[PDB]
């Protein structure tokens with residue numbers, strides 16, 4: 001259990017229960033001590049956050065193409081935040097805010113991390129990434145970081161094999177239940193979390 005101590009952690013529209021930036025700090029120190037390193041944020045809906053944190057990352061399907069299939073994260077919490085919410089409404093039109101998660105990978109997995117300046121959405125990106133990674137997509141126990149299709153923000157994709165090796169914990173950066181869909185309010189980012197958010201150096 002890499003969640004540190006305090007009470008039971010629970011995701012909810014009111015905010016991640018029993019999660020404070022201080023507990024995150026304890027959790028972060030424990031992970032680092034165990035040889036894990038932070039690689040980015042992952043925004044998703046509440047239940048997927050719960051599953052990811054306590055069950056671990058688990059690929060489910062889509063092999064025909066989905067060439068870029070994998071676990072998408074981002075060094076910049078603002079990019080991942082856009083995804084921390086339900087993808088479709090319920091029968092009554094409600095779209096709940098989700099949660100931001102912190103993704104860690106064993107340091108021994110770092111050799112598989114690559115970065116390119118080429119926008120991943122570019123048509124020839126696949127060919128360039130395959131050259132960079134040394135094999136045909138999909139990504140395996142490796143990852144690639146590159147500019148989002150449009151926006152300039154760097155997105156990181158973890159091959160499912162790598163993703164399933166991660167330890168993921170809640171972020172102390174909250175989503176706003178009053179502003180679903182809205183952009184991340186940078187002032188809602190705890191200084192203490194920003195402090196433990198440096199990324200590892202990737203190969204290019």
Ligand SMILES: CN(C)CC(=O)Nc1ccc2[nH]c(=O)c3ccccc3c2c1
Nearest residue numbers: 041042043072073074079080083087155
């Ligand atoms: C949940 N819907 C957005 C459908 C989907 O297929 N994608 C998905 C679902 C969750 C995602 N979470 C992220 O943190 C993220 C970060 C950088 C780039 C993409 C993502 C991301 C993408």
